[PDB]
Amino acid sequence: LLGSNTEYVAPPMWEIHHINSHSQCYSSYSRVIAGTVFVAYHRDSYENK
Amino acid sequence: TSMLDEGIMVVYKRNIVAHTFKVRVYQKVLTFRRSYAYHRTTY
Ligand SMILES: *[C@@H]1O[C@H](CO)[C@@H](O)[C@H](O)[C@H]1NC(C)=O
Numbered sequence: 001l002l003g004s005n006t007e008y009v010a011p012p013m014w015e016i017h018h019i020n021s022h023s024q025c026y027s028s029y030s031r032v033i034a035g036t037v038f039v040a041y042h043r044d045s046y047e048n049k
Numbered sequence: 050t051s052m053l054d055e056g057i058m059v060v061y062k063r064n065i066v067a068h069t070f071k072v073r074v075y076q077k078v079l080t081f082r083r084s085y086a087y088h089r090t091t092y
Pocket of ligand 1 (some may be wrong): 017026030039048
């Protein structure tokens with residue numbers, strides 16, 4: 001067993017609009033920092049369901 | 050059978066307003082983000 005970072009993040013506004021008009025979120029966070037965009041997925045290698 | 054000092058008065062409270070003073074706090078903030086790299090999608 002090793003570490004466990006956990007960070008709390010605001011969704012993007014397009015997603016806010018999705019959330020509260022469909023009762024569902026996308027299984028991916030994406031934020032750009034410096035140059036490139038970074039991205040996380042729910043279970044590994046998942047799609048954007 | 051038939052049959053009172055006067056003066057000037059100043060009243061004082063106990064005073065409760067706690068004493069303020071500013072304090073300088075020196076500290077450093079190290080932050081470690083970590084990422085993966087495949088094709089053009091950085092994880
Ligand atoms: C997931 O889908 C939304 C809309 O379908 C899109 O805006 C978002 O960029 C996608 N995220 C990915 C592909 O990582």
